[PDB]
């Protein structure tokens, strides 16, 4: 993409496009699809420990940002552009998982209901690290609780996955730039 001509496109977004247009491997896309479907299934049934063990690498960065609304023409104001809703290493994810499983987590009774819809999967091996798989996918995440509370989350995920213990591919980075600035879902206490 030429971002001087395509005026609305960020440098970051143009870089990510290039990665997938480049060298399509259908088998990789299918592997990525399996990986993500299985991850979503574990999360949906609230098998959080299994998710950590089977899907999350020890060196993970799990990050979801919220970007401040700024003028499209803005070029002077230069302070922190975003905050981290999540910016978790493995130990921090574990803390969150223990919080979910704690029997005195009162908000988890009656049990929550999650349903995830994963779409638009693309996969490409890193050019310079032959063992690093880039996977892009979008998620709709539906959380229902307490009779009439329903929250629906929408996001694009930029992941890096790499083979770990036992040759199992595990998530080593997830980056989400959350599209809604003001959350209308009570909180963002879901693993996107």
């Amino acid at each position: 993409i030429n971002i001087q001509e395509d005026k609305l496109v960020s440098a970051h977004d143009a870089e990510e496009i290039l990665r997938f247009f480049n060298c399509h491997d259908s088998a990789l896309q299918q592997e990525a699809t399996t990986l993500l479907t299985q991850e979503a299934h574990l999360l949906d049934i609230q098998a959080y420990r299994a998710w950590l063990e089977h899907c999350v690498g020890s060196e993970v960065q799990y990050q979801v940002i919220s970007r401040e609304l700024r003028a499209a023409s803005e070029r002077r104001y230069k302070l922190n552009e975003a905050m981290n809703v999540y910016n978790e290493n493995f130990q921090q994810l574990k803390v969150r998982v223990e919080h979910q499983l704690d029997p005195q987590n009162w908000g988890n009774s009656p049990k929550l209901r999650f349903t995830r819809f994963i779409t638009n999967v693309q996969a490409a091996m890193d050019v310079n690290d032959k063992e690093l798989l880039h996977i892009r996918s979008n998620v709709i995440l539906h959380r229902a609780r307490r009779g009439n509370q329903v929250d629906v989350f929408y996001a694009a995920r930029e992941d890096k996955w790499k083979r770990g213990e036992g040759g199992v591919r595990k998530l080593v980075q997830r980056f989400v730039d959350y599209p809604e600035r003001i959350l209308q879902t009570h909180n963002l206490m879901v693993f996107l």
Binding site: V64, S66, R67, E68, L69, R70, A71, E74, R76, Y77, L79, N80, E81, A82, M83, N84, V85, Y86, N87, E88, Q91, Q92, V95, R96, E98, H99, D102, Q104, N105, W106, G107, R146, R181, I182, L183, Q184, T185, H186, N187, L188, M189
Partner: protein, 446 residues
């Protein structure tokens, strides 16, 4: 409802009618007697440091533009065009010398002045009195050590006086530490609670921590973690509670400088705070140096709350009686190393941000308590805030304000709601003052 006569808060603040969290007519009345009357948090110097820097902020349900002027002062204006009422600024932060309306192109200065009108000569000639068409300005804008508050009511007390006895507790962290910075941008989340539910909780509610936050305490690593599931009561002298004439109040948990931060930050923080406290002993004395590195859960009346040391900074922006837009910033000490500031900022959001696992513990509590205030059999029921009543003091030789010398109690609720009731039943600041001339006596009865 007749707000002059209706007893919404009982004498000494001992109870409140549950309807206060649900009644939309009262909410509308609060817009006038709470939000249009009192000091409201806007921003920090650190977010608009240079000329032309601005942010938008809510003041009640109104939106304002808060702008750093060329002369270094800050002025705030309604985010509403003076022509046909369009919202002028659609972004949250930026730098500009002025703001142009997207409807008919009227251009306002950073100083609020109507500076240009398209084709003014051909259309209006000399008939448009631009001098009278400046943006509607927030009458009062003052700073507490870089923290900028606004007030629509020209008759309000100065911000410092408004903070009353609470200022003494905030000063060691806000002033004597070398100063704080606000780390933006904030998280923003809507909850289905009345603004008073989180406000009361932060002002005064240590009781809930062990039970509400049992899972976060247990999982999450932190210094206050002995409380998980009410396994342990803090020792006597673990803290105190205070409140003040104009409704601001806080809890003090002695020495809890690492606050809600997980054990990954505890050693570093406890080292940093202890080192600074050692220097401050010489400057402000041992008690106040200790307060600096003690955990304060405070509400600056009406709807700005914070946890010092934890670094949590909140605005409970009102939408309606059962809807509040929660803004969450991190506060850091300016002289901390930058890497620590970054990690502290992330940890604030981790615990109390949009995906804050501690904050999530509070959701059902705040939301159901608020929504229950709409339910027919509960409207006229009494919410209780009597814990520690008859043991509070005023005019103590060391700790100012109305003070309960215990870590856990409802002292700060009583002062919050005494101020609330005095405002809701008054038409102006003079009447509030008249209604408050025996404020501390009322709070220390029995």
């Amino acid at each position: 409802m007749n707000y002059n006569n209706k007893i919404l808060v009982s004498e000494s603040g001992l109870s409140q009618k549950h309807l206060i969290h649900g009644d939309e007519e009262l909410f509308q009345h609060e817009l006038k007697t709470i939000f249009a009357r009192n000091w409201l948090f806007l921003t920090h110097d650190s977010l608009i440091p240079a000329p032309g820097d601005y942010v938008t902020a809510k003041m009640g349900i109104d939106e304002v533009i808060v702008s750093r002027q060329n002369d270094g002062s800050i002025r705030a204006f309604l985010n509403v065009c003076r022509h046909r009422g369009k919202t002028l600024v659609s972004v949250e932060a930026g730098n500009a010398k002025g703001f142009v309306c997207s409807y008919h192109g009227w251009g306002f200065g950073s100083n609020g002045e109507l500076q240009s009108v398209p084709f003014e000569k051909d259309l209006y000639g000399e008939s448009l009195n631009k001098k009278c068409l400046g943006l509607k300005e927030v009458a009062r804008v003052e700073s507490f050590h870089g923290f900028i508050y606004g007030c629509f009511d020209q008759e309000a007390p100065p911000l410092m006086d408004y903070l009353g006895d609470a200022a003494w507790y905030l000063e060691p962290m806000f002033k004597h530490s070398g100063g704080l910075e606000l780390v933006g941008p904030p998280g923003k989340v809507v909850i289905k609670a009345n603004w008073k539910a989180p406000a009361e909780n932060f002002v005064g509610d240590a009781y809930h921590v062990g039970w509400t936050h049992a899972s976060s305490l247990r999982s999450g690593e932190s210094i206050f973690s002995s409380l998980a599931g009410n396994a342990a009561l803090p020792p006597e002298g673990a803290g105190l509670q205070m409140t003040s004439k104009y409704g601001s109040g806080m809890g003090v948990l002695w020495d809890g400088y690492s606050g809600v931060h997980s054990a990954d930050l505890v050693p570093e923080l406890m080292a940093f705070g202890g080192a600074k406290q050692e220097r401050l002993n010489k400057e402000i004395g041992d008690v106040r140096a200790r307060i600096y590195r003690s955990h304060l859960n405070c509400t600056v009346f009406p709807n700005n709350s914070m946890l010092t040391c934890s670094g949590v900074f909140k605005v409970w922006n009102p939408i309606d009686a059962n809807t509040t837009e929660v803004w969450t910033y991190a506060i850091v000490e300016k002289d901390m190393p930058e890497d620590l500031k970054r990690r502290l900022a992330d940890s604030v959001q981790r615990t109390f941000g949009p995906a804050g696992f501690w904050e999530s513990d509070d959701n059902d509590n705040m939301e159901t308590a608020s929504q229950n205030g709409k339910k027919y059999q509960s409207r006229d029921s009494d919410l209780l805030s009597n814990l520690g009543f008859g043991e509070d003091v005023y005019g103590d030789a060391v700790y100012p304000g109305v003070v309960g010398k215990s870590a856990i109690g409802e002292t700060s609720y009583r002062g919050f709601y005494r101020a609330y009731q005095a405002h809701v039943s008054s038409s102006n600041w003079a009447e509030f003052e008249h209604a408050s001339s025996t404020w501390h006596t009322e709070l220390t009865k029995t």
